[PDB]
Write a protein that binds this ligand. Structure first.
Ligand code: VOD
Ligand code: CA
Ligand code: CL
Length: 269
C-alpha cells in the first residue's frame, strides 16, 4: 500500500498529478549525502564530489529522504513525491557524517549546470557566506538551473547561505497548523515555505522514516518547480521561481514566510 505524507497533500501535489503533471522530463539534482537504491525511487544518474566516497549511495539518510519528498514513485508501495516522475540525480556533496565543504558543494552545482539539470535541491547551508559557493550558485543559475535551498534551522530572523543569495530560492519550514516551525530561519531573502515537521519519506535500508527541518521543506518546493516546468517547458528558472511565489498562499508577513505556502495546484492551474 502507498500512503501520501501530510506535506505532499498540504502542498496540493495530488491535484497536479490528477492533471497529468508528475515532473516527467524534468531533471532534478539532489545535492546531499547521496541517494540510496530504494524500491520507491528511480535514480537516473549522478556524481560524487566527496573524496573517499566515490559511490553516490547514501551513508547518512538525509539525501535519500530529501529525494523521496521530491520524487518517491507513484505505485502501490511506500510514499509519494511531489513530482513522482522527475528524473532524479544523486549529487553527493556531503559525506556519511552529513558534512562536506564549500568546494564539494560548488562542484555539485557546476555538475548540475554542465549536465542539464532544471532544478537543484540544496537542503544544506551555513550561517556564513562563501565566495566559492556563491560563484557556483550564480554559474548554475546562468546554465538554467533553479537552485532551491533550505533557510536553515537556527530559528533566527536571518537566513543562512547559500539560501540567502539572490540566485537561490530560499525555503523555510511550516508545521501542520501553517505556522513557521520554531527552528525555521526567516528574514531577508526568504522566498517561500513548505512543510518541514514530521515529514515521512524514503530512507536507506529500503524503509521509510520521518525527519524535521528546513531540509524537508526544500524538496517540496523543488518538486513543485518540476511540476511547473513540465507544464511550461519553455520557462526559465526565474519564471518558475516567480510563478511558485506568485501562486503561494499567504501565511503572514513576508519577513516570516516569504510569499507563503507553496501550492502546486495553484501553480499548475
Ligand atoms: S536539514 O536536515 O534540515 C539540514 C540542514 C539544512 C540547512 C542548513 C542551513 C541552511 C543546515 C542543515
Ligand atoms: Ca510509492
Ligand atoms: Cl491536492
Amino acid at each position: 500500500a502507498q500512503s501520501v505524507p501530510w506535506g505532499i497533500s498540504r502542498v496540493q501535489a495530488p491535484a497536479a498529478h490528477n492533471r497529468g503533471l508528475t515532473g516527467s522530463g524534468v531533471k532534478v539534482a539532489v545535492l546531499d549525502t547521496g541517494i540510496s537504491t530504494h524500491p520507491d525511487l528511480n535514480i537516473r544518474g549522478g556524481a560524487s564530489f566527496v573524496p573517499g566516497e566515490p559511490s553516490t549511495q547514501d551513508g547518512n539518510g538525509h539525501g535519500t529522504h530529501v529525494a523521496g519528498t521530491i520524487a518517491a514513485l507513484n505505485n502501490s508501495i511506500g510514499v509519494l513525491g511531489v513530482a513522482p516522475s522527475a528524473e532524479l540525480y544523486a549529487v553527493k556533496v556531503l559525506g556519511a557524517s552529513g558534512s562536506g565543504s564549500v568546494s564539494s558543494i560548488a562542484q555539485g552545482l557546476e555538475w548540475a549546470g554542465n549536465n542539464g539539470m532544471h532544478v537543484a535541491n540544496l537542503s544544506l547551508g551555513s550561517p556564513s557566506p562563501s565566495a566559492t559557493l556563491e560563484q557556483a550558485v550564480n554559474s548554475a543559475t546562468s546554465r538554467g538551473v533553479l537552485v532551491v535551498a533550505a533557510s536553515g534551522n537556527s530559528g533566527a530572523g536571518s537566513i543562512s547561505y547559500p539560501a540567502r543569495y539572490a540566485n537561490a530560492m530560499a525555503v523555510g519550514a511550516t508545521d501542520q497548523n501553517n505556522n513557521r516551525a520554531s527552528f525555521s530561519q526567516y528574514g531577508a531573502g526568504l522566498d517561500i515555505v513548505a512543510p518541514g515537521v514530521n515529514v515521512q519519506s524514503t530512507y536507506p535500508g529500503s524503509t521509510y522514516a520521518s525527519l524535521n527541518g528546513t531540509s524537508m521543506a526544500t524538496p517540496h518546493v523543488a518538486g513543485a518547480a518540476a511540476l511547473v516546468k513540465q507544464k511550461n517547458p519553455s520557462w526559465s528558472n526565474v519564471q518558475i521561481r516567480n510563478h511558485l511565489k506568485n501562486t503561494a498562499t499567504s501565511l503572514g508577513s513576508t519577513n516570516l514566510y516569504g510569499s507563503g505556502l507553496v501550492n502546486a495546484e495553484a501553480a499548475t492551474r
